[PDB]
Write a protein that holds these residues in place. Structure first.
Motif: not given
Ligand SMILES: Nc1ncnc2c1ncn2[C@@H]1O[C@H](COP(=O)(O)OP(=O)(O)OP(=O)(O)O)[C@@H](O)[C@H]1O
Ligand SMILES: CCOC(=O)C1=C(O)C(=O)N(c2nc3ccc(Cl)cc3s2)[C@@H]1c1cccs1
Length: 284
Positions: A40, A49-50, A52-54, A56-57, A73, A75
């Motif tokens: 992190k 961060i974007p 990583v979010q992308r 995952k989504d 997933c 954490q």
């Protein structure tokens, strides 16, 4: 729900600037996963961060044999953990380098798997944008497992979105429209496909140079050549994919989609329906 102590970690499978992929066994089941671990602090300290979010989504949307699967997933205070399918045989690129190039049967088989994968991905309204041999992994059974979705894009169905505006990709495989019009579309992945087929047959991708700007200049001029011996129906297919106008590439929506691409003569002997259950031809 799962926690780090639920696994025994083994060897590192790969490293990024803010991720590390480790082979892991889940104690309660004895199953093997490739766990991608994101620190992190680093993703925060680099505003990634974007990405990583992308990843995952996008991965959460995929449910097809030719794509890496995201199983879970979790954490903790320091890290994000993503449980992925393990592709034991590594990158397609390793095999191109080791054997130099693929024979016609192997070129056809692996090209067909990539086409089947893209048909599924594009049918979900997702552009990969970084398709390349490094991102096409091979499972234990030698079927493909496409990975690397942090630079992929889910096009919005509500607006019938066709173009994506982020500048992402890899110079050798990047499409002319992204360079000149500053957006990509699903057909941008068909351009990459053409480059990959060329590379499987010829041993190198078609636009290549020691500096990225030089590559860009050749892409936008369609400056490339075929070696004298190149399977003729594969050459025809490449010439129908490496087209500057993204609306004129075989497989694109304006050309009426994957049907005409799967009908190309290079694929005459392919049985598309059960590719993932066929035994892949041996690579030598
Ligand atoms: N699912 C997997 N099975 C086996 N090996 C994998 C798997 N996923 C990734 N790897 C290996 O881990 C390495 C790093 O992948 P990772 O997704 O961590 O970052 P990356 O996208 O390659 O790096 P960057 O973000 O800097 O481009 C790759 O070299 C890849 O071969
Ligand atoms: C659900 C989640 C997402 O869709 C998502 O993007 N998540 C992220 N949480 C964090 C925390 C810190 C940082 Cl630096 C990035 C992210 S990205 C949540 C996750 C929880 C467990 C694994 S991912």
């Amino acid at each position: 729900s799962k926690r780090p102590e639920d696994f025994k970690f083994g060897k590192i499978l790969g490293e990024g600037s803010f991720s590390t992929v480790v082979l892991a066994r889940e104690l309660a089941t004895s199953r093997e996963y490739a766990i991608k671990i994101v620190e992190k602090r680093h993703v925060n300290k680099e505003n990634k961060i974007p990405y990583v979010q992308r990843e995952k989504d996008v991965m959460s949307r995929l449910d097809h044999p030719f794509f890496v699967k995201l199983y879970f997933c979790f954490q903790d205070d320091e890290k994000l953990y993503f449980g992925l399918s393990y592709a034991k045989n590594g990158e397609l690129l390793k095999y191109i380098r080791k054997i130099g190039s693929f024979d016609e049967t192997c070129t056809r088989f692996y090209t067909a798997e990539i086409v089947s994968a893209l048909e599924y991905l594009h049918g979900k309204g997702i552009i990969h944008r970084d398709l390349k041999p490094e991102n096409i992994l091979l499972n234990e059974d030698m079927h493909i497992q496409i990975t690397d979705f942090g630079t992929a894009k889910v096009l919005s169905p509500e607006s019938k979105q066709a173009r994506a505006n982020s500048f992402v990709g890899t110079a050798q495989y990047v499409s002319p429209e992204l360079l000149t019009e500053k957006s990509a579309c699903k057909s941008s992945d068909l351009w990459a496909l053409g480059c990959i087929i060329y590379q499987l047959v010829a041993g190198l991708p078609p636009f290549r140079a020691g500096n990225e700007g030089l590559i860009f200049a050749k892409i936008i001029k369609l400056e490339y050549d075929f070696p004298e011996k190149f399977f003729p129906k594969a050459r025809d297919l490449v010439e129908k994919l490496l087209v500057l106008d993204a609306t004129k590439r075989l497989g694109c929506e304006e050309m009426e989609g994957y049907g005409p691409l799967k009908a190309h003569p290079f694929f005459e002997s392919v049985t598309w329906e059960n590719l993932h259950q066929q035994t892949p031809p041996k690579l030598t």
